[PDB]
Amino acid sequence: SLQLWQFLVTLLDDPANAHFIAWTGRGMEFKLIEPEEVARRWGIQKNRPAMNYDKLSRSLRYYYEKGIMQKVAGERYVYKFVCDPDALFSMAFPD
Amino acid sequence: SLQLWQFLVTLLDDPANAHFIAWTGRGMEFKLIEPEEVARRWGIQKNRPAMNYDKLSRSLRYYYEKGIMQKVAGERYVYKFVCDPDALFSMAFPD
DNA sequence: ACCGGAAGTG
DNA sequence: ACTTCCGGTC
DNA sequence: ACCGGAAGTG
DNA sequence: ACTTCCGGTC
Ligand SMILES: [Ca+2]
Ligand SMILES: [Ca+2]
Ligand SMILES: [Ca+2]
Ligand SMILES: [Ca+2]
């Protein structure tokens, strides 16, 4: 079953979702255009009725410690997957 | 009559006030230890019944544009008078 | 907490 | 020369 | 808006 | 592997 970061990649890959979540075109950077719609869909995925962006974003922040994501500083709702050796290892072989 | 920055200097000079506002000892840096007490006293000074730190701090921020103050980044309630040529001119000859 | 736009006041 | 309000961002 | 501590859950 | 809550800071 899908971890949050994997679920986001499935959303980002499909043009059907571009109105609420999209790759920006710079490396692996992405924007949660409608972050509450991303949250609603993650909530459905996990059977979490009350999921919202506040709580979703906290898991994104935990990904900073895991080394697979970073915030794009000063860009609203914009994050990026990290392009570095530790990030690829963690994403290639998720536990 | 006293401008905000002058009134603060009068407070900072007197040891009687050290519990709510004090020079930190680094150049002209100072801390509003109890910022609402600073606000209450500024309010009395200006006959502004409802003065608070939110509104007082906005005038401090206007002083950034005037060039006589700066925030000390990341230090709670800590500001400094600027030590540079424009600041001294503005403080020596206030309009 | 902090930032700055916007509109206001003898 | 601020005051008030307030939307936006570590 | 964003940050991270703290305590929680099949 | 997050979820929930929430105090703190541009
Ligand atoms: Ca921005
Ligand atoms: Ca490593
Ligand atoms: Ca601090
Ligand atoms: Ca000059």
Encoded tokens for B6 = 């002058």
Q: Is the CB of A73 under 7 A from strand E?
A: yes
Question: Residues with Cβ within 5 Å of ion ligand 4?
Answer: B 86
Sign of the alpha-carbon torsion through A84, A85, A91, A95: negative
- In angstroms, how far is the first alpha carbon of chain A from the final one? 12
In this structure, is the CB of residue A51 within 7 Å of any atom belonging to strand F? yes
State the residue for tokens 């609603």. Answer: A40
CA–C1' A62–E4 (A): 9
What's the Å distance between residue B16 CA and nucleotide D8 C1'? 38
CA angle B23–B28–B29, rounded 5-degree value: 60
A48 touches strand F (CB under 7 A): yes
Q: How many CA atoms lie within 13 A of B69 on its CB side?
A: 22
- Domain A1-95: which CATH number of 1.10.240.10, 2.40.160.40, 1.10.10.10, 1.10.3720.10: 1.10.10.10
User: Residue A31: beta bridge partners?
Assistant: A22, A78
**Of B28, B35, B80, residue with least CA distance to B56:** B35
What is the secondary structure of B28-82 as a DSSP string? TEEE-SSHHHHHHHHHHHTT-TT--HHHHHHHHHHHHHHTSEEE-TTSTTEEEE-
A64 CB and strand F closer than 7 A: no
The residue with tokens 């994104």 is A60
| Cα distance between residue B40 and residue A76, in whole Å | 36
CB-based contact A67:A90 (threshold 8 Å): yes
Cβ of A71 near strand E (under 7 Å)? The reply is: yes
Q: Which two tokens stand for residue B80?
A: 């400094």
* Cβ of A13 less than 7 A from strand F: no
From which experimental method does this structure derive?
X-ray
Give the single-character DSSP code of B16: G
Strand partners, A29: A80
| Rg of chain A on CA atoms, in Å | 13
Nucleotide minimizing C1' to CA distance for residue B76: C1
As a rounded value in angstroms, the CA-to-C1' distance for B11 and E1 is 35
Strand partners, B30: B23, B79
Q: Resolution of the coordinates in A?
A: 2.0
